[PDB]
Amino acid sequence: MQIYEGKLTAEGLRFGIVASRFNHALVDRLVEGAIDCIVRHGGREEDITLVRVPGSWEIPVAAGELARKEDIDAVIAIGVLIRGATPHFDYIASEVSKGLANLSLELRKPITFGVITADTLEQAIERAGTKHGNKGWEAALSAIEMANLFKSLR
Amino acid sequence: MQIYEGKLTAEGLRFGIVASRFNHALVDRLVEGAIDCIVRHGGREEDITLVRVPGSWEIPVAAGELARKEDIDAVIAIGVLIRGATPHFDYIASEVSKGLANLSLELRKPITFGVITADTLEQAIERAGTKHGNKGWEAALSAIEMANLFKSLR
Amino acid sequence: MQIYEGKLTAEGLRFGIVASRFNHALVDRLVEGAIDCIVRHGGREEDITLVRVPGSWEIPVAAGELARKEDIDAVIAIGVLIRGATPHFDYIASEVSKGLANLSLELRKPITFGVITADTLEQAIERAGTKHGNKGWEAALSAIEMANLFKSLR
Amino acid sequence: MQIYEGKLTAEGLRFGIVASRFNHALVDRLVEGAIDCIVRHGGREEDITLVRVPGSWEIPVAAGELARKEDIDAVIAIGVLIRGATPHFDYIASEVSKGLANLSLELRKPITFGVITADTLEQAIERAGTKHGNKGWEAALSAIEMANLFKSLR
Amino acid sequence: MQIYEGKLTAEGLRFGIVASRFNHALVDRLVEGAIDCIVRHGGREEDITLVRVPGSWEIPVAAGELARKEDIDAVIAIGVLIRGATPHFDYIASEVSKGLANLSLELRKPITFGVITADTLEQAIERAGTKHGNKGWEAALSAIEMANLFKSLR
Amino acid sequence: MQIYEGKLTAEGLRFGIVASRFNHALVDRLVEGAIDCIVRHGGREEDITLVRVPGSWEIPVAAGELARKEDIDAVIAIGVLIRGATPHFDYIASEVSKGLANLSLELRKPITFGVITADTLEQAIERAGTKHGNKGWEAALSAIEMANLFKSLR
Amino acid sequence: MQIYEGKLTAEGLRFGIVASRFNHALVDRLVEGAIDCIVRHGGREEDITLVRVPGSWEIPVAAGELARKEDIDAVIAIGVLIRGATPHFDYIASEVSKGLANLSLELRKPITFGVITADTLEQAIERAGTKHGNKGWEAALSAIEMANLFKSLR
Ligand SMILES: O=c1[nH]c(NC[C@H](O)[C@H](O)[C@H](O)CO)c(CCCCCP(=O)(O)O)c(=O)[nH]1
Ligand SMILES: O=c1[nH]c(NC[C@H](O)[C@H](O)[C@H](O)CO)c(CCCCCP(=O)(O)O)c(=O)[nH]1
Numbered sequence A, B, C, D, E, F, G: 001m002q003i004y005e006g007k008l009t010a011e012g013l014r015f016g017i018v019a020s021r022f023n024h025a026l027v028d029r030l031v032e033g034a035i036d037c038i039v040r041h042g043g044r045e046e047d048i049t050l051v052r053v054p055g056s057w058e059i060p061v062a063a064g065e066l067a068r069k070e071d072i073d074a075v076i077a078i079g080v081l082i083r084g085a086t087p088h089f090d091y092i093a094s095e096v097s098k099g100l101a102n103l104s105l106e107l108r109k110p111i112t113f114g115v116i117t118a119d120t121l122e123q124a125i126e127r128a129g130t131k132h133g134n135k136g137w138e139a140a141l142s143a144i145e146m147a148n149l150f151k152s153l154r
């Protein structure tokens, strides 16, 4: 059987992070986690490119530019959506996830999902460096694995 | 670390606004907010191109034409959807959001979302220049930031 | 500020109407409304091309052919979906709306939405020339505006 | 006014049917209905190409191959989805309907929807040759009409 | 009609920020927002003077010193009050707001209110960079506008 | 950015404490806390001036005299108000807090708030050296910080 | 400030794993996770020493022997305790945790805790490679970090 997998040492890997500003008190923790995951897995912080955008809505178009860079091995999308009184959350969450996934397939490059899509503030806090971990760390770790995998698969 | 971000001074930026007429008593307030945001951030009103369409349904096709203009730095989509008795709201809201996001990725240009998708009239009024702010102002401000960001990112 | 808008006089405009036969007792009223709107706004009935198809499912593929005609300025999609006992309604309504919107963006031509998506028969009757107006008339009026707009925007 | 429509005599028409095997005790009735509809409307059974696949999930990829045949005038998609305990039904139903609709627009050829998407076994039986008719017959009849229409429209 | 208003570009403006330490985990987010608002609107971080004090109670006396500086164009008061079991919250909230407003009128200089006065922890988190935005950003933006306005009004 | 802050070593600082006698069994604990805080932070007890007055009502007029002393760096107001059966508590609490805050702004000198304003006896005990700490210690610590801050700010 | 931390690359590190057999269907998944974590972080599987014991009760005495090996950098304790009808769970859980912690302090070597202590079977399954992750992976990852840290700290 042929087996392909990615290891988790990030030496020489170069990452793009696209992080929105809406709910920044939480997003900022996700960004801390993603960078820490990269660095302590052997990646250099100098090999990270961070792009900030207003909201989750704007993440895909920026990610599309980062993912097209030949010297970016994977992109990590970071944002925090918390449902309000209207259906607005649904439409933004739907479009951010679809855009990112579509870009990954079109550009044949990993784009990992570190966007929290929570019903409540409490759920968002839980997933941004408290009791349920840090979604930025998770998405960074995934990006490390996928970039490594792609060294032999792509 | 490389860091890219957009500032919020709008000097020299050129914007497209696509605004629907359904629910115009509210849309009109969103349009006032978007223009004011642009102007008081240093953008010239002369550098704004405003396109009117019948409903949110028609916003994407018009935005597609504006976004293709080489001298438009970003497009701001403005509309007001308020749920009625049928599922019709769902299908229009889904298509307007998908079209705009798809156009942004295909044309590699920011298109911001200033379309209210409310369950009730009250929710719509709240978001059109009353207690929950002005969604047109928010989407304009996002467009200013994204246009600036794109000056170095794109 | 540059301002683009469509007027509502239909002189010289040429329209495609795609109308399904499922629920024809109601669709037929929508078709009457769309034609009347066009004619009494100055459009010639001879400049209308009417295409009939079995159900809403089939509307997109036919509209795709009409919208590709160089001598059609806009297409008006007309149909009546009424929810039954199963989720079938959801999947047809989703695909008809997505197809029409996608075609409009791909062909860069207005395609307006005059498809009723009702939960009940009563809701459908209300929107087909009774208490809530005539969705065909509404979609025709939108098509007139968009075709006019596109004379300067496209 | 120019009027295009398809008649229902199937003489000389050639059809592709893609039929899944999941829930075959019902699918098989849909297949009987579709063939009967074609034959008794004047089509030759020899002009029917039947493709079998495992489940509704696999219907689109096979239909995509049939629809690309120059000597197939329309494709009829036949399957039976019945909701179980999980959301799995939703994702398969969503993808089968979207794939078929997308293929029809991309290949500019009619692909009709004879896939039952039922909440219960009873609903499925009702629509597979019992009290609510036969969805295969319905989709075949639609295909006849669309193929005829396309002789002048396409 | 004579019309006076402030624009939102902060070039050359100099701001005083007085920030308390009680509830610092939240205040610190407010401070981040206020600085970011200033900087990305064109203000220089070097033109910001930040004064820290123990609690909201102490904000006025420090703001009084900052507002008296000839080279400070506006002061931004930042703090977080969260109601406890006693009426203590009421008396501190009343005195901080009255002191700041009184100082502004006496010194004829803008002092903006970025003090959260919440009944619950949750409300405070909402307003400190999560779902209800960032009160520091809001008060900074107000200070930019008022300083600009005062260039012609004062 | 210019940053001003006060450290917490109290060497050379001179404090005024104004302490009321109503509820003295609790006030006395607040006074013990304030003195201890000052001394163990390096302040000399000889540099403390303690003024006693009958009730919280009388605290402001005495504090006004202490705050005017050139050799007093900050004043600490200490008292215990516990609500009784009438609104009397409200009027005394309102006037003590307003007087102290007003004096601080008028004399441009820190006056910290160590007056408990409790609804119940239990709440008062909690805040006077039991489970919720010692409000005198808190107000003393604030005074240390403010006096230090004022060495560079004033 | 001096800062010590461990990175997460496991190159050259040597680990002891002590895994009990009670509830092995779950323990076995924890063991898979711990090994995978080690290997894909750069550790060699050959550098892992696995010791099996009957139950969680016996884990400490075996870990005590592994931790005393000069060529073991850290020990990972793996087990699954699920509460039954009696207090027995409490006493075993108390002694396993105390023994491991005591051994770590006495031998001045990291011993990480990958023992599930669940009230229900469901909770145990959740934490053994399903919805709440894999406690073996978590404890392995901790051991990598601690072993690295101890290269400079110990
Ligand atoms: O990342 C985000 N963004 C966001 N809205 C802003 C949006 O992403 C765009 O920036 C904006 O629409 C302009 O394009 C929000 C708010 C979504 C919830 C709206 C609450 P409501 O339904 O009560 O109006 C979020 O939680 N996370
Ligand atoms: O921007 C819009 N548009 C709109 N409908 C018009 C639509 O966008 C098109 O213009 C029309 O369908 C013609 O294409 C509506 C109404 C949607 C709710 C319908 C109520 P109902 O479900 O009770 O029929 C809106 O709220 N905001």
Ligand SMILES: O=c1[nH]c(NC[C@H](O)[C@H](O)[C@H](O)CO)c(CCCCCP(=O)(O)O)c(=O)[nH]1
Pocket: C020, C022, C023, C054, C055, C056, C057, C058, C079, C080, C081, C082, C083, C084, C085, C086, C087, C088, C089, C092, D111, D112, D113, D114, D127, D138, D139, D142
């Ligand atoms: O325009 C339409 N079409 C339609 N079904 C036919 C469909 O559009 C296709 O023609 C058919 O599937 C063949 O392709 C229907 C019926 C949809 C509701 C089905 C009820 P059920 O869920 O009880 O089975 C409609 O209301 N409006």
Ligand SMILES: O=c1[nH]c(NC[C@H](O)[C@H](O)[C@H](O)CO)c(CCCCCP(=O)(O)O)c(=O)[nH]1
Pocket: D020, D022, D023, D054, D055, D056, D057, D058, D079, D080, D081, D082, D083, D084, D085, D086, D087, D088, D089, D092
């Ligand atoms: O045509 C189909 N297919 C199908 N599942 C099989 C699927 O289509 C694929 O063949 C399979 O997933 C392999 O690709 C099913 C079962 C769907 C409902 C699943 C029940 P559950 O949610 O209880 O698991 C169906 O009803 N009709």
Ligand SMILES: O=c1[nH]c(NC[C@H](O)[C@H](O)[C@H](O)CO)c(CCCCCP(=O)(O)O)c(=O)[nH]1
Pocket: E020, E022, E023, E054, E055, E056, E057, E058, E079, E080, E081, E082, E083, E084, E085, E086, E087, E088, E089, E092, F111, F112, F113, F114, F127, F138, F139, F142
């Ligand atoms: O900015 C602040 N300050 C503050 N108290 C400290 C106060 O501002 C002074 O620093 C102190 O009184 C010394 O002067 C608090 C606590 C207020 C609520 C008290 C709870 P309680 O009523 O249960 O005692 C706050 O939330 N935010």
Ligand SMILES: O=c1[nH]c(NC[C@H](O)[C@H](O)[C@H](O)CO)c(CCCCCP(=O)(O)O)c(=O)[nH]1
Pocket: F020, F022, F023, F054, F055, F056, F057, F058, F079, F080, F081, F082, F083, F084, F085, F086, F087, F088, F089, F092
């Ligand atoms: O510091 C104080 N002072 C005080 N009352 C005395 C007041 O401050 C003056 O000393 C007095 O009014 C004379 O000027 C009180 C009592 C206030 C509550 C009154 C209870 P009642 O409403 O039941 O009459 C206190 O709790 N703490």
Ligand SMILES: O=c1[nH]c(NC[C@H](O)[C@H](O)[C@H](O)CO)c(CCCCCP(=O)(O)O)c(=O)[nH]1
Pocket: G020, G022, G023, G054, G055, G056, G057, G058, G079, G080, G081, G082, G083, G084, G085, G086, G087, G088, G089, G092
């Ligand atoms: O790792 C373990 N071990 C274990 N019991 C065995 C024990 O660890 C020793 O091996 C045994 O006592 C012999 O020393 C158990 C069972 C504990 C719950 C007992 C159920 P009861 O209270 O219903 O009797 C476990 O869940 N996980």
